[PDB]
Symmetry: D2
Subunit: 123 residues, 4 copies
């Protein structure tokens, strides 16, 4: 259980901030602030993590979603990050993400961006 390991403030390579609380059940709840894109200030995030990982040195699977609507902006889109928390002295959250925009069925073929974010506790 990496409840304490995961809970807190994280930073990615683009300068975004991810603030999360991990529940004893597997819940993730928090806020995301993006350094890039059609976004300003904090956005709600919710997700899930494996609260009883293997003890064989494997990482801890986790994922979360941000819908890019808050009181300031609505970018009609949602990103999900899927990845794993790895602990120890250079602790990291390594993810791949999918960002889907709401589109017309005509433009659905260009609705989805794919990328990868590495989060750390420092920067």
């Amino acid at each position: 259980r990496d409840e304490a390991g995961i809970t807190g403030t994280w930073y990615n390579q683009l300068g975004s901030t991810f603030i999360v609380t991990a529940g004893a059940d597997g819940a993730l709840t928090g806020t995301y602030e993006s350094a890039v894109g059609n976004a300003e200030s904090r956005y709600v995030l919710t997700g899930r993590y494996d609260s009883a990982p293997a003890t064989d040195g494997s990482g801890t699977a986790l994922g979360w979603t941000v819908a890019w609507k808050n009181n300031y902006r609505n970018a009609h889109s949602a990103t999900t990050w899927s990845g794993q928390y790895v602990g120890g002295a250079e602790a990291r959250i390594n993810t791949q993400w999918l960002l889907t925009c709401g589109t017309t069925e005509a433009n659905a073929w260009k609705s989805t961006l794919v990328g990868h974010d590495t989060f750390t506790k420092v920067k």
Copy 2:
């Protein structure tokens, strides 16, 4: 707002069942039962959707996460679906997903599956 449109029971092409409640804020909460993989019975899911989409015929962006641990099994993994709800008489949720397994850093390059699921209200 597709709060009522989204809320309810959905089925995908593999025979999985997705049961969700959409909140007025943008919350998604529910259960997922997979027809395939290292899974049995219901798993908690949580996510987010755009509660005020464009009115120009575009779909409604949304996403959610399942961590594949419940009282019966723990597959040390998590899937996130990112997509859009499209309403009208053949209503669909069209998604792409990322499934990450917890791995050793040696095997991280083979940690993540990518696929696509279409959900409908019928089948």
Copy 3:
């Protein structure tokens, strides 16, 4: 060996045409015409396929790339499709694709679209 199975003209769900010749070695060469996007007429494609698949009913892995430059347009981008050929009476090529645009390092986080195309011999 699905050299003859693969060689010929294929159509996807968006109305694109994929014309390919499969070599005895594993080569794929041909042309792609996209029904959507910043594209007109034929574009060169090249790729690879598994020329000696398993005989246990598994599909045949394959992939190919189009750079979206020809004599008519240059969209400064490239799509790769990765997938498998499945034979028999409703023969299909099932793929997922990544389309990368050339970008500034500032915009690299939004350089890559992900999707899925199903090709058939008819439509």
Copy 4:
């Protein structure tokens, strides 16, 4: 045109070697040796790149495919890398990839791995 920029030997974060020749037309041809997975020695690769990129500081889109069959092994699979070449003193090829295995239609939902590789001229 980054024909000379691209042509040569490249190394990724996993210790793989990518040896490529870029043609004046847009062709890529070469060999790939993987440091990980069900692979040994060199595998043919073929692909495409944008031979006349924008001059506005954007990268050069490119992609290529390896089918994992050679004289030593056949892993019934194919990887495609889609990405962009960025020049200058720390020159990089930044990619995302899809690796599809041939599967039964029953197991198609778990056929495809997604990842990201950064290649450099040194290491």
